[PDB]
Structure formats: structure tokens, C-alpha cells
């Protein structure tokens, strides 16, 4: 996974943004877009992977989610927005080290990414409450994974990282800041006296009493609890670097392998949803590390890209401030490798979701946006430079259409007697056009690509 | 397309210059040089592509133009000078973004490049009037394209960019400045209250009220309304860079991909017509990005060149100040890929145009300068280093001959009873010499090239 | 061609030097060394190429010259020294531009390089007079070429450049300066009011009244009247650069393509005849642009070298100051590609020339120094690194022998009753030694080279 | 040849050192180590090459020498130490130029390297006397070669360079300085009136009166009398550079081709015999110019190395100051390419020399150190990286053994009644162990090398 967080003064429109590429082990694994209404939310939750049992409150809020179609390994809801307009994305797998694992080992029957959104998001009314509830659950039940989790509301953005079996720490992203986070523990300098941080009450004592701190002064959590490995230099750091080079070019050097890139950053401009999707779809464009570029075979394959074949979904959760609360929550969503898709700005304030995004199964179905988007990206991958101009045209055309629908829908919100049905209609329009444009793109690729097949022989007359 | 604009204090002779390569999608599409006399100008205009219907004033001025020979997609007049010595070239296709398109979408039955010179140029008596008339027409009829348009008279040079379906902005190029503009929105820092700017009356409100401004301070129009994409770094920015490196070498860095190259520039010397044609014919000479050069296959093909196979016409519209107004307007013109042609200084103050430039059809005819020039450049392309010395000789020889004719014609203008007849004779001499020299060049290329054919076997004795 | 000029305080011996490689279009064209006595000089001169007819004074001075053996295209005397010890070399083909050619076109029945030494040198008694006479002749008869011409006497060195059909400018080279000049207009910053300059009486008015000056301040003649083309960057500028790097290493940058290298330079040491011949024989040694070096095929062939297959003759005209006037004038001379020859210091104060240097015809004859020198350089070209050590040995040995003869001849000049016969005998000794050493070199090359033929098979025992 | 000189305050042990690689034209030419006792020194000397006849004093001193085994071209004694503990090495072939050769040509029946040690060394009692005697002989007999000669005693080190047929100059190396000298004239800035210089009484007048000085200020002898050729940049300067980079790394730039490297240098540490042998055995290790290294074929063969196949002998003549005069003179000696040999510290105060170093003939004999050393170096050359570890082990082991014998012999010197017999015994021990270790090295190379022959096929079991 790759995550990007944006505070409310750092965005172009004064919204908060939290985002993540939900990457899996296998390239394809069908995803669904689903609203969990309170009556369908469990009160007695048991996980599939760890068999952890968690009793949940009897007053869950409605929330959007992105569950797996195939439930063999559990729900894997990934991310969503609840009816209090709180957003959560879980998780970004991060790193750990043997010194802390020796003190607080993973808990085999603890919580995992399979579970976190389901057991936290419906029960909180702010990003800070989300942080605190997750922290409480880690302390009580433990975890078997090293994870990073984002929370947001219309005011604040938070990042929580889990530490060993039971510990955790969290930082409030400054209003004017952004973060790019790869699969590596991210939190750096950490002030135990700040109102903008939260952590296990015993975290400082854990560090101080067990010789965990490698630094001569102060506390840097990823120095203490995380990694700075050779694998980090190719799997993780270059993704952080590319994102920071894009947003903060004058503050970022030219070494993608750098182990001490800042966590919290300040961009040279305000950030759009389009900007976030670009970075989340990137593959080191205009460097020798671009697998689609001009570099040597070894340079082209040295770094893990951000856009990747195993992007299962990408979500950008936006809590807006320039609108009434009933339309503040936007669950931007796309499926498959991010090179040939577009995120669609779904209104979260709905009781159901559009069929092309809801109904993927394990059966290949090109009427569904998961399978259609994956198919498009695979074809594109076979000759990127050949298809990229159609891709670029489609991105502009599709995003323009989505924003027109959003702007029209926003403009007529006042006086609507049935808000959820009004917004379900808008989401249906968005999904309909998203499918039409995705399908037209693939059609154009197939038509032009067929002209350039190896299996050809034309008379040039 | 690529456009170059030069203010009256920036030129070597105190003229204003506006220029453009009129590039198409297909490599070849025959062009004509045509004077539209008032009786030939429509009053009830309907476009072919969009079916926009525009009622026009009953007092059109005579103007030069470069219409397509084949009218399947409409007239496509490209550029010309009217009898008030106002010059106009439309268009440079530029860029846009999804945020502004979502607010002011393209108008499918609006105006386009097919139409603009025809509906603007005959009805204005200054460059500034051209800007205001085009702005008004965009508001009334809308547009379905993102375009840049140049205007000039003997005093001022203006650049207008269209924004969404109805909006626009324009900048007066300072007298001592030049601009190089590729297929990307160009206007940068923009002062709404400046004497040097014009725009939609609601443009500032559009920006402020809809969170369009990505910058913490001030207004940069292409930041707001344009693009800074990966495709821009290879398709657009290097053309700007190469031109600026030529004119302002000490003010320009060494990164062709730079997204924030200045719009308005100041050269280290005064600019000649020869200079403008050089840049408009260029292909990154003396860099690794020259397709005819020594670079790797990938470097040689990375950037879109300025001179290119699909140059249909190139025009440099010059309004001179060192002469009587009856000879001030010069419509410099050439056809086909700019590597093997020369611009000819046709006097615009005429009622008809020379046969070798006027009469191209869809039938291949090497007595016509469109077909002859294209044929020459295609042959030249097959072995550029072999043919370039003949090319260079021809350029000097031809331009010298044109300037001798211009100088002689200018010198004898006083007392001429029929100016249009006098200048038509001068244009006939110009076209006759242009054809003879183009033909001699192709002949020399064929003669020398035939000696170097693959299909040869010589006894070396 | 390439020319090198050296003022009297810039040379190692206090002489003035003007020099040129007389390069042709064809690789080989036999040259002769000939003294034109007054009785053999035409009074009614008609050229072959242009059919210009020039009545000449009835009191011509004796002069040395280097006429073509084959007179199909006229005499082409190239360079010489007259009996007033005035030296002249004509010409260095330079460049022009279409703006000045449009105002003052070439004159087809004018003077050319075929003619200039013949019609100027016999009639002047100083370098300054030479400049003024040529200037006058250009005004009277015009010219059909863009040319640079050098003049010298024992005090001054001048460089004249022709501009259009009739105009010209000339600069006196400072005593302590040198110039390296390729096939490009050279004169830069120009002070009309200086005693060190001469020009067309109307030159400033021509510039001022016709908008010819591209610069904001001052007058740079090659900016105004010359070229700064892409072809200049590979054909011309690197030759200037290499020469300046050799003489002025600390004042010269590392860009051979530089368009604004200075005209007038100051070396870090005094300049020898050996130095001048080295530069005139050079091929970018110790750079990637050396065709005999280690660079890529494209780099090795990118630049026109100074030593080249079509060096027909090389002459270094020296007017000495450390001796009586009767031995002051030295016409240093060699033939063929400069890589495998040596310049021989012929006394100019003679009535006839040595047979091995005088008698070339169109019939191949290896007893003649033109054909012998060409043959040597061609063989050397086939494996330069294999033959270069013998070449280097030969250069030192031959130049040492020439200087011994010169030193001996100079030392015994006092009391010689018949100076011309004394010096003709010295020249015969020089030419005889030159032939013997050239022949021994070729013999050594043939003997060693034959051992390394491809057509070989040796038993290694 | 390559020569290294070290003043008495620059050495690690307070000795003076003069050294040279005696390189020939053919790779192999057998050398002998011979003491010439006074009874066998000619009084009526005639050379073989030039047939010069020199009457010599009747009181020659005993001296060591390194004559050729094959006397076809004369004795070629190379270098030695006489019984006054004066050292001399002759010669380093240097360069000249045509301007000085034109004034003072080579003398065909003069003295040469064949002769110099023989006619100078036996008759002088200080280095300064050596300089003066050689100077006198050059004036009396002339020379046919350009040569550099080193002299030393326990106080001073001198370098003499011959200039033309009769002239010469010499510089005393400062006590704290060193010199590295290749086959190029070396003496730079020169003070005629200094006690540290000697020269032809007319040298300054020769320069001043014949315009030989190329510099604006002062006198640099190699500027005046030497070369700065293209061949110098590859044959000579890189050897100087590599030595200066080794001894003076912080004072030496990174351009091996530099023409104005200093003559006199100051190292950053005191210099050992081991250091001198390293530089004299070098082949640009750890640069791309190392023929045994990783550079391109052209880079690997661009420069002449210091260690080379045609090293016939290497000698380091040491006059020590930390011991009684009876053991001050050490004639360090090795044979063959310096990559696979070691210098052995023979005491010079002997009447005869060890058989393994004395008795080489034209017949191949592996019991002799000339033929054994050459054989070792040839085998090593066939796979340097394969054999270099054995080479390195052998160098340390052998030099350690020599030093132990030297230290023991030095320590027991007092009271030895027959000094020559005592030191001949020491030299015998040295030669015996040198042979045993050279032979063991070759044996180890043959044993390991045979396992890695191309002509092999092993079962890997």
C-alpha cells in the first residue's frame, strides 16, 4: 500500500483528504463498494483469520466500505466514511524490529487489517475518537500485524501506527501539511508533551527502561520501533521520495533511497484530488526507475512503484467544508491498477451503492467495474507508450464529467425532501458515466491496438 | 502548433510579429493562400464541425487567409492580415483541467479553430478590438476547444487563451518582449487590474468562489486553468525551452521539462524574421533530443519537435513601422515540413494571390508549392545529414532574393497609381522565384541523392 | 580554409605572420610555387570565372604566388609576398546573411578569390595600402563571394572582410595579439573612429538606416553582417576554439560550439612558426572530436578539422624584423593534407622558384612535392596511430634541417654581391632537403606498413 | 626510461637516491652487473656507434656498472657508483626542438648514452664534479642524442640535461625535494646565477640573442629548449603525473596530460626505496589507463606505463648517511619488466659481483637472474590478476629478507679487516636469496597457472 494524507489548509478546497492504495498479494481480488446499514452490522464480531472475538456497541453508525467479494479470509472492508462524516482507512502495512518484538510480540488471536474498519469506524464521531478507540482495542485484544491507519473528519487528520502486539502511537497531521507513507514505519520526531500526539500510556517508559532508543537526544519513533533496512531503500523510500518531489520539489533532494525523509511535509501549493490520484498512480515517471521508461532493465525494476498491478482498490476519502454536512463526505473510488482508471466522487450519505461498483463476484464479468478496470490496465501494460495518449484523454474527459455531476448535484441540495435518494441518483449517474467512459477507453484501446498486433500483414496501399 | 510573438521594440526592424506553425493530425493536407474580398465573405455563417450559426456584420474588411483546399471539415483559414493592418492567428491548441471543465464545460455547438479568423478578423481595426470581439463571441456562442489566439497591429501584440466553454483571458505582450508558446496553456502571473490584461468580467470571481486557485498567493492562470502534466514535459515544455534557450540563453536553465518556464521573455538581442523561422523549423539541434542527431533512439524520439512532418503551413504575420501603411502588412508564408521550405514575404495589401500558392487541390501537383514543398521535406527526411548543406545554401539564397525584391518594391512605392496591382506584381515575382528555387533545390537533392541510392553498384574507375 | 594571424609583438622572433590553409572542393588539385616577375604580370586582366576586366598599373612589383597548375578556372594565386615585403593571402571564404545580401547583392561579373592577389599585391607598398586598394576595387568592380583577406608588412597585420557585393571592413590586429579565423565572418566589436579600423565610407549609414543592427548597444560586424548558424557550430566555431584553447588555454572555455568566441586574442606566450603549423595541421587532438581518436563514430565526424584531405597548400607568410630587408620576407610553404608535410621557409626575395615546388602538372609525378606530399598523407590516413611516430620524427628532423640552412644563409648575407642568386641557391638547398626527407618518410612508412598488411601470413620463428 | 631523484632530507633514511629504468627498444637485451677495476678501464676510448675517440685520465676510480652482455653496439654501462661514493645514471632520453637544433645540431661523431658513465664516473669525486666534467666533454666532443643524466653523492643530487650538440644545463635538486622525469625535457624555471645551477657559459646569450625564449618573463628551459607536444601528453606527462599523485596527492590535479607539471616537487611524507620501486614498476594502477585494469581497450593502451616489458634493468643508487663511508654506497638492482622482480641492495664497495647477476650471455639461462626475471614477468603478463597475489607476497618476503641481511651486515661492519671480501660475501648472500625467491615465485606461478590452462578438462570430483 501507499497512503497520502492532506490537512484542511493544505487542500485546494479546504477539505481533509485521507487516501490509500489497497494492494494485495495476488494481482486480482474482486472488490465491492458497500454501505453497511446499522441493522446489518454485527454486535458479536468474530474474525476469520485470527478468530478474535469482539463484542461491539449496539448503536453502530451507517458507513461506506470496500469489502472483498470473496469472503474466504474475512470481510477486509479497507476504508469508509460514517454518518458522522468521519473517515478511516486501514491499513498501510508498516515495519517493526526485533528489539521491540522481543518485548511485545505479535498476538496470534489479535486484531488485523481484516477487522479494523468494521470494529472502529461505526462507533466514533471524530478522527480523534477513532484514534483513541483503535488504541483501546489494540491494548485490549492485541494485533498480529504492523499497521498504519488514517482517520479524518472535517477538522482533523490523524495517523496511527501500531507497535508490537499491543502498543501504538498517533500524530495529528498539521492543517497545512501532507504526508506520503509507504510500507515502512513513518512517525519520526515525537513530542510526548504535545497536544497533537497520542500513544500508549506506557510507551515512553517502554523506550526508556529497555534501552530501545538509538538516538543520543529526543525520540524518533521509527528509529526506535521501525526499520531502516536495505529493503526499505528500494521498496519504500523511493515512493515517499517521489511523492515529496512532486509536492515539495525545492525541499526534497535527489536520493530516492534516503532513510530519513520527513514524515510531515509542506507542499509548495495546495493539493487537489487530481494531484493525489496522480501520485497514487505513479511509476517514477521521468526517472530511470520508471518500468515503462527508458532506463536499463535493472534500474526499471529496482523500485516498487506506487501504481501497480496489485492495486485492488484506490480510495480518496474527502470530508468537505464548502458544503452542507449532508454532502460533505465523498468516498472517491476506483478499482484495479491505477494507470488506467479514474476515481469517482461517490456521495457517502446513501443507503446503497451503484450496481457496477457493488456487484463483483469471483466470476469474470466485464459489466462490472472491478473486472473492466483490471482488463483495461492489463492491456495498457502491454504497450504503455502506445496507449498512454488515450489514457490521458480519458482521464481529463472522465474527471471533467464527474465534477460537472458533483457541481450540479451540490448546487441543488437545498430543499431536497429525500437526501439519500437524491444522492443515490447522483451516484448512479456517476457510476453510469464512469462505466461508459471506462468501456469506451477499452474499446478505443482494442480497436487501435488490434491494428498494431504482431499477428498482422498489411498491403501498404 | 508552435507560436512565436514579438513586440515592436523586440524586433530588429521595429515591426510586430505574430507567427504559428499550423500543424494538423494527418501529415499532409493541402493549403491555399487566399484573399477574401468583402463580397466573398459570408454574412450568415454556419460551421461544418459544430454547426454553430453566427450572423456577421455587413461590412467585412478584405483579409488574407490560408484556407484548406479540401473543405470537408470547414474552411480552416488559420491566419491573416486585414485591410486595417490587423493580424490574427487562430489557433494554438492549449490545455485545460477537470476542475474548470466541471464548472464551464465545452459547448458542442460552439466556435472552434475552424471558424475563428473568419468570424473575428474582418470586423476589427486593432489587435485590442480583436481580443474584445473574440471574448464577446466566446460568451455568446461558447467553444468546444481549448485555444490560444494571437493578435497584432503596428503598435500592440496580444495573446488570448480560452478557458472552458465561455471564459477567456488575454495579455498584451510588452513591446520589448517575446513569447514562445506550445500546445499548453501559457499565461502565468496575471494582474486583473493591469492595463496589459483583459478577461471575462467574472473570471476573478469564478476562481475565488470555486476554490480553483492552487497557489497560496496571487493568480497564475495556467496554474489555475491549465495543466502541468507528465505529457507536458515531453510534448510542450521542451519546445518553449529550446526557443528561450535560443533567444535568452543566459536567462534559461538546462531542463527542457521545466513546468514553470516564463511566458513573457526578454531576448539578449533584437529578433529577425529569419530567427523566428529558425525556431519554428527546429528539432532540438545540437542536443540529444534531435531526431536527426546522435542521441539514443529513446532520447531522439522523446520530445515533440517544432519543425515536424505535419507542418501544413507556417506563417509569420508582420506589421511594419518603417514604411507607408499600404506596404506595412506582410504575410510571410510557407508550406509543408519546415525543414526544407522558406517563408516568402507576401504583401498583404492585394486583391488576389499568386497561382503557385493559391491553387492546390487534393490532386498531387508538383507545379504547386504545397505539394512541391512537402515532397522536398520528405526526401530530405530520408537522409538529413546528406541533404542539409544544399538546404542551408538554398535558405540563404532564397531569403536573399526575397529581401532584394521586397527592398526594391518598397523603394518605388511612392506615386504608384494602382497599389494593389503594383503589389500583386511584386507577389508574383516573389512566388515565381520561390518556386524556381524550391524546384532547383529538389532537383539538386534528386540528382545527388540518386548517386547514393542503395540500389547501386559502381565500378570505381 | 583556416587562417592564423600574428602581430609583431606576439611572435617569438618579432616578425609578423599571416597564414592560411588553401583548401579546395576537390581533395587534390596540383599547386605550383611561382614568382611573377613584372614583365610577366598582365596589364589588361580578365578573369576566367566572372569575365571581369581590370586594367592594371604599368608598374607591378615582383611577387611570389601559389597558382593552380591546371588553369581551367583561372590562376588562383592564393598568397604571396612582393618586393616591398608586403604579404597578402586571399581568401578565407566567410559567411553573410540575407538582410545585407538583400541590400547589396553579389555582382556576378565581379572580383573573386581567383583574382584578388593578382590585382592587389603587385601595386601596394604597405599592408594598409593593400587594404585600401582592395576596398577600392570592391567598390569599382564588386565581388561575387564573401571573403576574408589578410595583409602584412614588417609593422602591421590587417584583416579585411568583404560584405555584400561592394562593402567591406578591416581591422588592424594589435601588435601583441593573434587571430584564428575559420569559414565564418570574424570581425566583432568595431570602432568606426579608430585608426585601427578602415571600412566602406557608408558602412555605418548602411547599418543605421536599414535596421541591420541586432544589438541594443554598439556595433559587432559579424552580428550585423555575418552568421551564427547551426552549421557554424560544427563547421567553424570548433576550429576557432581549438586554436584559442592552444594559445589561450586560461581564457578559453570548453564549448567548441560557442558563437561569440573573441576575434582578437592574446596568447599566454609568444608564437612560433612551429606553433602556427601545428594548429593548421590539427584535428582536435586529445578530444573526442578527433577523427583519428577514441571517440564515437558520430563524435569523430561531427566537426570539420583544420588539417584536412583537401589542404591544397599551406602558407605562412613571415615578415621578419631581426634581419636586413633583403632576407626579411619568408614564404613558408607546404602541399597536401597537413598531417604528413612540413612548411619550408623559402626566401621570397628571389626571381625564380625550386623545381620540385614549381613543376606540378595534372600528371601524377612523385618527383614533385605536391604529389609526393599528398601520397604520404593518404597512406598515413589509413592507419594514423601506426604511422604517427615516424611522422613526428620527420617533423622535428626536417624543421631542424630547414632552420640550420636558414640560420647559415642569414649569417652570411653580408657582402653578397648578388642577393637573389644567393637566396635562390638557399631555396634550392631547402627544397632538396625537403624532398629527401619527405621521400625518406614515405619510404619508411611503406617499408614498415608493408610488414603490417592485411594480405600477410607469417611463420613466427 | 623513467627516473626518480630524491634529496637527502626527502628520504626516509637521510640518504640521497637517484634511479632509472633502463628501457630498450627490444623487450629483451641481457644485462650484467660488473665492477670495473682501474686496471681494466680504457685510457684510449673509442665508441662503437659514433667512433668518437676520447683520451681518458690515467687514474680512474673503481666503479659499479650495468653493461650489456652483447657488445655489438658498445658497452652501455647505464649507471654505477665509484669509490668516492659518487653515483651516476646515464641516460634518460629527453626531447628537444627545431629552433635550438637549428643553432647547435647533433654531432654525428660525438658522445652518447653508450659512453657517458664510462668517460665521466671514474674521474670525479663529487656530483658537482660529475656535472662539470660531463659539461666539458659535451663542449669538447659534442653529442648525437638529447639526454638527461643524474649525479649524486652523500650531500647533493643533480640533474643535467643536454641541449643540442654541445650545450647543457644542470640543477641541484633541493634537499627536501624529489623529481619524477620521463622521456621529455624536464628542467623548468631556471636561475643562471644560482649556486644550485650550472650550465654552458653561453647558454643565456644563446637564448637571448636568437629569440629562443617563448615566454614574456623569466627563463623556463624546457619551454625554450624542449617540447610540449601531443605525443608528450601520452608518452611522458602521465608518468610524471602518476608519480606526483603518489608522492604529492594534495598538490597534484587530475589531468595526466598536463604539460607544465613541476620539475621539483615536495612529497607529503619521507620517501623509501620501496616507494621508488613501486613508482618505477607502475602501470597507472587504480585508473582507467592501467593496461591490466578495467578500462576500455583504447584507455588501457593510451599511455606508456612506467613498468614495461622493455625494462632491461632498474637501478636505485643510494648514498647513505646513517652509516660509515665503507658501506654508504648501495647499488640496488633488478632485471626485466618491473612487475615481477625486486631490487636487491648490493653494496657497491666490492671488487667483483655475484654470479647470478654478472654472467648473463646471449644464451638463455634460467640460472641467471636476467633470464629468470624476464621469464617470470612474461608469464605474469598473461594473467596479471591471477598472479598478482603471489607477486605481492613475494615482494614483501624478498624485501624483508634483503633488509635483514643489510641490517646484519651493517651492524657488524666495525673492525672488518678485508672490507671488499666482507661485502662481497654479503652480496653473495643477497643474490643467493634473491635467486631462490625469484625461482620459488616462478615455480608457484607455474604450478598454479598449470591448473588453469586452457588445455584442460577436469572431472569435478
DSSP assignment of D442-461, as one string? HHHHHHHHHHT-SS------
Measure the CA–CA gap between C235 and B185, rounded to whole angstroms.
38
**Cross-chain Cβ contact A392/B231 below 8 Å:** yes
Residues in chain D closer than 8 A to C392 (CB atoms): 229, 231
Measure the CA–CA gap between C101 and C225, rounded to whole angstroms.
9
Contact between A224 and A187 under an 8 Å Cβ cutoff? The reply is no
Q: Which three cell numbers stand for residue A302?
A: 529496482
Task: For D5, list phi and psi in degrees, rounded to 5.
Answer: -120, 140
Contact between A332 and A344 under an 8 Å Cβ cutoff? The reply is yes
**Cross-chain Cβ contact D211/C12 below 8 Å:** yes
DSSP A31: B
Measure the CA–CA gap between C410 and B276, rounded to whole angstroms.
60
3-state secondary structure of B142: coil
Q: In the block, which residue shows the cell 592501467? A: D290
Q: In chain B, which residue's Cα lies nearest the Cα of A14? A: B211
3-state secondary structure of C166: coil
- Indicate which of B323, B400, B429 best probes the interface with C, i.e. most C CBs within 10 Å of its own CB: B400
Cis check: omega of the bond before B91, within 30 degrees of 0: yes
Residues in chain C closer than 8 A to B286 (CB atoms): 230, 233, 257
- B384 by Cβ neighbours in 10 Å (0-12 / 13-18 / 19+) ranks as middle
**C273–chain D nearest CA distance, Å:** 10
Nearest to A141 by CA among A111, A100, A169: A111
Nearest to D60 by CA among D76, D40, D45, D79: D40
Strand order in the sheet with C157-163: C79-81, C87-93, C147-152, C157-163, C167-172, C197-199
Q: In chain B, which residue's Cα lies nearest the Cα of C103? A: B404
**A38–chain B nearest CA distance, Å:** 35
Question: Does the CB of B253 have a partner CB in chain C at under 8 Å?
Answer: no
DSSP β-bridge partners for residue B111: B143
Measure the CA–CA gap between C355 and C429, rounded to whole angstroms.
11
**Cross-chain Cβ contact C211/B399 below 8 Å:** no
Q: In chain D, which residue's Cα lies nearest the Cα of C9? A: D216
- Indicate which of A290, A299, A396, A434 best probes the interface with B, i.e. most B CBs within 10 Å of its own CB: A396
Alpha-carbon separation of residue B21 from B93, B306, B337 (angstroms): 11, 8, 10
DSSP D285: T
Cis check: omega of the bond before C91, within 30 degrees of 0: yes
Measure the CA–CA gap between D328 and A126, rounded to whole angstroms.
93
Measure the CA–CA gap between D59 and D82, rounded to whole angstroms.
13
**Could you give the residue numbers annotated as active site of C?**
1
Nearest to D140 by CA among D72, D210, D200: D200
Task: For B240, list phi and psi in degrees, rounded to 5.
Answer: -55, -50
Residues in chain C closer than 8 A to D99 (CB atoms): 12, 272, 274, 403
Q: Which of B13, B14, B400 sits opposite C98 (nearest CB)?
A: B400
**Cross-chain Cβ contact B102/A406 below 8 Å:** yes
Q: How many CB atoms lie within 10 A of CB D258?
A: 17
Burial profile C45-76: b = 16 or more Cβ within 10 angstroms, e = fewer: eebebbebebebeeebbbbbbbbbbeeeebbb
- C175 by Cβ neighbours in 10 Å (0-12 / 13-18 / 19+) ranks as middle
Contact between B13 and B352 under an 8 Å Cβ cutoff? The reply is no
Measure the CA–CA gap between A95 and A226, rounded to whole angstroms.
5
Q: Is the dihedral of CA D36, D37, D39, D44 positive or negative?
A: positive
Alpha-carbon separation of residue A283 from A271, A275, A334, B168 (angstroms): 19, 14, 18, 35
Cis check: omega of the bond before A257, within 30 degrees of 0: no
Residues in chain D closer than 8 A to C400 (CB atoms): 98, 101-102, 105
Residues 6+ apart with CB under 8 A from C364: C371
Q: Which of B98, B213, B230 sits opposite A399 (nearest CB)?
A: B98
Range of the domain at A153: 1-461
Q: In chain B, which residue's Cα lies nearest the Cα of A402? A: B102
3-state secondary structure of C343: coil
Measure the CA–CA gap between D411 and D420, rounded to whole angstroms.
16
Q: In chain D, which residue's Cα lies nearest the Cα of C295? A: D298
Q: What chains are in contact with D, requiring at least 3 Cβ pairs below 8 Å? A: C
Residues in chain C closer than 8 A to D211 (CB atoms): 12-14, 322
DSSP β-bridge partners for residue D329: D319
Residues 6+ apart with CB under 8 A from D237: D182, D184, D256, D257, D258, D259, D261
Q: What total number of domains does chain B contain?
A: 1
Question: Do the strands D63-65 and D53-55 form a parallel or antiparallel pair, or are they unpaired?
Answer: unpaired
**Cross-chain Cβ contact A322/B105 below 8 Å:** no
Angle formed at CA B337 by CA B336 and CA B338, multiple of 5 degrees? 105
Q: What chains are in contact with C, requiring at least 3 Cβ pairs below 8 Å? A: B, D
DSSP D40: G
- Indicate which of C11, C12, C178, C401 best probes the interface with D, i.e. most D CBs within 10 Å of its own CB: C12
- Indicate which of B8, B11, B12 best probes the interface with C, i.e. most C CBs within 10 Å of its own CB: B12
Contact between C232 and C97 under an 8 Å Cβ cutoff? The reply is no
Residues in chain B closer than 8 A to C216 (CB atoms): 269-270
Q: Which of C98, C211, C233 sits opposite B274 (nearest CB)?
A: C98
Measure the CA–CA gap between C213 and C221, rounded to whole angstroms.
9
**Cross-chain Cβ contact A12/B298 below 8 Å:** no
Q: Which three cell numbers stand for residue C102?
A: 538583400
Residues 6+ apart with CB under 8 A from D323: D410, D413
Query: Which method was it determined by?
Result: X-ray
Does the annotation mark A199 as catalytic?
A: no
C residues 285-304 closer than 8 Å to B (CB): 296, 298-299, 302
Q: In the block, which residue shows the cell 641467471? A: D368
Question: Does the CB of C211 have a partner CB in chain B at under 8 Å?
Answer: yes
Residues in chain A closer than 8 A to B299 (CB atoms): 294
Measure the CA–CA gap between B225 and B164, rounded to whole angstroms.
8
Q: Which of A286, A399, A407 sits opposite B257 (nearest CB)?
A: A286
Measure the CA–CA gap between C156 and C173, rounded to whole angstroms.
7
Contact between B85 and B8 under an 8 Å Cβ cutoff? The reply is no
Measure the CA–CA gap between D19 and D3, rounded to whole angstroms.
5
C177: left (phi over 0), alpha (psi -120 to 50) or beta: beta
**Cα distance from N-terminal residue to C-terminal residue, chain B:** 50
Measure the CA–CA gap between D89 and D333, rounded to whole angstroms.
13
Q: Which three cell numbers stand for residue C156?
A: 602591421
Measure the CA–CA gap between C232 and B316, rounded to whole angstroms.
25
Count of positions (residues) in chain C: 461
Residues in chain B closer than 8 A to A294 (CB atoms): 296, 298-299, 302
- Indicate which of D211, D295, D299 best probes the interface with C, i.e. most C CBs within 10 Å of its own CB: D211
Q: Which three cell numbers stand for residue C406?
A: 636558414
Q: Which of C98, C103, C302 sits opposite B396 (nearest CB)?
A: C98
Residues in chain B closer than 8 A to A270 (CB atoms): 213-216
Angle formed at CA A166 by CA A16 and CA A118, multiple of 5 degrees? 50
Q: In chain A, which residue's Cα lies nearest the Cα of B300? A: A294
DSSP β-bridge partners for residue C50: none
Question: Do the strands D157-163 and D147-152 form a parallel or antiparallel pair, or are they unpaired?
Answer: antiparallel
Contact between D342 and D403 under an 8 Å Cβ cutoff? The reply is no
Task: For D81, list phi and psi in degrees, rounded to 5.
Answer: -125, 135
**Cα distance from N-terminal residue to C-terminal residue, chain A:** 50
Contact between D221 and D169 under an 8 Å Cβ cutoff? The reply is yes
Q: In chain A, which residue's Cα lies nearest the Cα of B106? A: A400
Measure the CA–CA gap between D340 and D393, rounded to whole angstroms.
11
Residues 6+ apart with CB under 8 A from D381: D309, D337, D339
B–C touching, 3+ CB–CB pairs within 8 Å: yes
Q: In the block, which residue shows the cell 657517458? A: D116
Q: How many CB atoms lie within 10 A of CB B46?
A: 12
Q: How many CB atoms lie within 10 A of CB B447?
A: 10
Question: Do the strands C147-152 and C87-93 form a parallel or antiparallel pair, or are they unpaired?
Answer: antiparallel
Nearest to B261 by CA among B238, B282, B281: B238
3-state secondary structure of D328: coil
Residues in chain B closer than 8 A to A389 (CB atoms): 231
B residues 105-124 closer than 8 Å to A (CB): 105
Residues 6+ apart with CB under 8 A from B227: B95, B96, B97, B184, B185
Q: Which three cell numbers stand for residue D259?
A: 604539460
Question: From the centroid of its chain, how far is CA D235?
Answer: 17
Q: Is the dihedral of CA A189, A195, A199, A203 positive or negative?
A: positive
Q: In chain B, which residue's Cα lies nearest the Cα of A295? A: B298
Amino acid at each position: 500500500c501507499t497512503s497520502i494524507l492532506v490537512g484542511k489548509k493544505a487542500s485546494i478546497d479546504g477539505s481533509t483528504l485521507i487516501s490509500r492504495n489497497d494492494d494485495g498479494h495476488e494481482a486480482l481480488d474482486p472488490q465491492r463498494f458497500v454501505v453497511v446499514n446499522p441493522e446489518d452490522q454485527p454486535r458479536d464480531y468474530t474474525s476469520v483469520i485470527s478468530k478474535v472475538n469482539v463484542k461491539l456497541p449496539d448503536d453502530p453508525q451507517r458507513y461506506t466500505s470496500i469489502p472483498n467479494s470473496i469472503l474466504t479470509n474475512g470481510i477486509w472492508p479497507a476504508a469508509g466514511i460514517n454518518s458522522s462524516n468521519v473517515a478511516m482507512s486501514a491499513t498501510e502495512t508498516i515495519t517493526t524490529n526485533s528489539r521491540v518484538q522481543g518485548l511485545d510480540p505479535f498476538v496470534e488471536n489479535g486484531l488485523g487489517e481484516e477487522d479494523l474498519v468494521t470494529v472502529v469506524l461505526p462507533y466514533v464521531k471524530s478522527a480523534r475518537e477513532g484514534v483513541k478507540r483503535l488504541g483501546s482495542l489494540l491494548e485490549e485484544y492485541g494485533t498480529y500485524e504492523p499497521n498504519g491507519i488514517s482517520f479524518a473528519d472535517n477538522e482533523e487528520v490523524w495517523w496511527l501506527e501500531t507497535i508490537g502486539g499491543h502498543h501504538w502511537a498517533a500524530v495529528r497531521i498539521p492543517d497545512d501539511a501532507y504526508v506520503v507513507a509507504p510500507n515502512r514505519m513513518n512517525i519520526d520526531q515525537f513530542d510526548f508533551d504535545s497536544d497533537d500526539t497520542l500513544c500508549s500510556s506506557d510507551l515512553k517508559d517502554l523506550i526508556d527502561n529497555n534501552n530501545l532508543n538509538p538516538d543520543f537526544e529526543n525520540y524518533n519513533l521509527r528509529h526506535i520501533f521501525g526499520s531502516a533496512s536495505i529493503k526499505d531503500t528500494v521498496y519504500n523510500n523511493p515512493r515517499t521520495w517521489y511523492g515529496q518531489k512532486f509536492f515539495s520539489p525545492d525541499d526534497t533532494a535527489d536520493d530516492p533511497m534516503e532513510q530519513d525523509l520527513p514524515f510531515i511535509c509542506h507542499a509548495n501549493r495546495k493539493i487537489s484530488v487530481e494531484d493525489v490520484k496522480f501520485v497514487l498512480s505513479s511509476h517514477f515517471e521521468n526517472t530511470k526507475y520508471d518500468v515503462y521508461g527508458s532506463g536499463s532493465q535493472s534500474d526499471k525494476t529496482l523500485f516498487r512503484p506506487i501504481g501497480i498491478n496489485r492495486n485492488h482498490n484506490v480510495h480518496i476519502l474527502q470530508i468537505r467544508n464548502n458544503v452542507p454536512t449532508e454532502i460533505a463526505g465523498i468516498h472517491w473510488l476506483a478499482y484495479g491498477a491505477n494507470t488506467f482508471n479514474t476515481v469517482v466522487p461517490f456521495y457517502a450519505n446513501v443507503n446503497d451503492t451503484p450496481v457496477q461498483y457493488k456487484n463483483a463476484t469471483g466470476k469474470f464479468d466485464l459489466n462490472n467495474m472491478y473486472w473492466l478496470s483490471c482488463t483495461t490496465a492489463l492491456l495498457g501494460d502491454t504497450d504503455y507508450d502506445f496507449y498512454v495518449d488515450m489514457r490521458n484523454d480519458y482521464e481529463l474527459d472522465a474527471m471533467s464529467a464527474y465534477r460537472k455531476i458533483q457541481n450540479d448535484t451540490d448546487a441543488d441540495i437545498s430543499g431536497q425532501k429525500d437526501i439519500e435518494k437524491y444522492l443515490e441518483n447522483a451516484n448512479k449517474k456517476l457510476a453510469d458515466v464512469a462505466f461508459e467512459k471506462q468501456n469506451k477507453l477499452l474499446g478505443d484501446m482494442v480497436t487501435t491496438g488490434s491494428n498494431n498486433m504482431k499477428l498482422r500483414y498489411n498491403l501498404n496501399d
